[PDB]
Structures are given as C-alpha cells and as structure tokens.
Curated annotation (Swiss-Prot), chain A:
Effect of inactivating the gene: Cells are still able to induce low levels of internalization, but are impaired in their ability to enter epithelial cells.
Protein name: Invasin IpaA
Subcellular location: Secreted
Location of this fragment in the whole protein: 565 to 587 of 633
Oligomeric form and interacting partners: The association of the vinculin-IpaA complex with actin occurs via the F-actin binding domain located on the tail of vinculin.
Organism for this UniProt entry: Shigella flexneri
Swiss-Prot/TrEMBL induction comment: Synthesis of this immunogen is repressed at 30 degrees Celsius and restored at 37 degrees Celsius.
Transmembrane portions of the chain: none
Similarity section: Belongs to the SipA/IpaA family.
Biological role: Rapidly associates with the first 265 amino acids of vinculin after bacteria-cell contact. This interaction is critical for efficient Shigella uptake. IpaA acts as a potent activator of vinculin and increase its ability to interact with F-actin. The complex IpaA-vinculin induces F-actin depolymerization along with the occasional formation of actin filament bundles.
From Swiss-Prot, chain B:
Gene designation: VCL
Superkingdom, natural source: Eukaryota
Tissue spec: Metavinculin is muscle-specific.
Entry's disease: Cardiomyopathy, dilated, 1W: A disorder characterized by ventricular dilation and impaired systolic function, resulting in congestive heart failure and arrhythmia. Patients are at risk of premature death.
Parent sequence residues shown: 2 to 258 of 1134
Protein name: Vinculin
Amino acid sequence: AIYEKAKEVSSALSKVLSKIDDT
Amino acid sequence: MEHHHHHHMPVFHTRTIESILEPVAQQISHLVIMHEEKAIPDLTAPVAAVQAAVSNLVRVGKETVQTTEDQILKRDMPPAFIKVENACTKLVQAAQMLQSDPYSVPARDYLIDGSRGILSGTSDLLLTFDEAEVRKIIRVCKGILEYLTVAEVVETMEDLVTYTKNLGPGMTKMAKMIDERQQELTHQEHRVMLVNSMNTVKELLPVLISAMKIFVTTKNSKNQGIEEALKNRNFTVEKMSAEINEIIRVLQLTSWDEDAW
C-alpha cells in the first residue's frame, strides 16, 4: 500500500503548492 | 566575472517512484525557478490533508517495519518517518505565517522547504521499501542458483519428474520478477543486459532438463560414455549459474544504495 499512500500525499502536496502560484 | 548557481537535493532511480515525486519535484524547482529576484490564500484547509495522508503513510510504513524482517529496511525506514515528520510540521507551521500574513517572503521559501521535505522524505521512504523489493527478487534467484546444483544429484528418472516440477515454477517466478524490474529501471544499459540475460536462462532450461533425462536413461543402459552426457549436464548448469549471476550482480547494482554498507 506504500506506493499508494505515497502517491496520495504526493498529489495532496502538489495541490498545496498549486496555491503558491499559477502565473 | 564567472557566475553559476541553482538548487539541489532531490534523488530518483525507479521509474514508478519518479512518476510520483517528479511532479512535486518540478513544481518546487519551478516555484524557485523564478530566479530574477503576489499574495497567498489560506492554505489551512489544503495543508491539513497533506498532513493527513502524510500521517497515513508513516502509519502503513511503521507497520511494514513490523512485518517484513528485511533488517536493512527495519533500520532504514525510521529515519524516513523523521524526515516527513518534521518536514510536515514546517508545512503546517509555514501555512500559519502566511495566514497571519500572506505577503511574507520567508514563508513562501519556508513553505517550499517544508514541502521539499515530505518529498525528499517520502522519496527515501519508497526508495528504501524498493531496495527491499529488489532484495526479495535476489533471494529468488539465489535460491534458483542453489537448486541447479541439485541437478548434479539426480540419478533416478523418477526424481527428474520431481526436479522439473520444482525448478520450473521457480524459474517462472524468477522471470515475472525480472520482467517487472526491467520496466522500472531508468537506464537502457541495465534494462538490456538484464533482459537478454534472463533470456538465455529460459532457453538453457529445456536444455539441461534434457541432458538430465538423456543421462538418467543412458546410465540405465550399457551405453557407456555418460561423460559426454553428464558433462553436457553440469556444463549447462555452469552456463545457467554464470548467467543467473549477471542478473543478481546487475540487480545489486540497482540495489546497493548510499544508506547501505
């Protein structure tokens, strides 16, 4: 399940750094 | 007047692991890429879930460290939970300075650093759990590089019927594993010398299996010259074993990592 929960936080994090900029 | 500089600190080797942290990787470097040297919303409700899943990860990660006896893992995993642990406290902490003030420039950088943690931290988490996988694969081969030697002890024909049914399935699993690995590899050189290798091993199987039967029936008759028959046997084995090692050695190449001695 590792490769899963990992990908999960990966996006959940990628969704946060998205509010940091969008040009 | 010569000048050159940029960011650093992000490793990657497995194909899958990359297609998981790669995004968040370029996002971070692209967010700092603005190297010419804009406010921030409320990341309270979107940084709490990153702390959520991050918790679940350590969870399923701390349990895996309670099952698989892969010692080198049971000792390499913990430090990871530490990285993501604190790397998160910053993410959550950073979101505050921005909420109390969304113009702070140290926070924007502070924020990135914390994210760079969960990324770099989760990286090792997977990387470690991975090397452990390449390990189980090695065990399989090591066991297939141990059974072949058993052929040199098959006299009775009836045994040959219990050596194949055994050796076969072993090579079967020892094949699927390799198939997956090559896909995960990020280097053409490795992928090749790894596949074509497992290739010969497959062909040399139906061969030694014959030299084994050809001998088991030749010694049963006055047919003198078991040498030309037996020799052909061990010779095949020696060829398979020599090939099987190329696989192991290759894997170990993609295996032995910094954290390892």
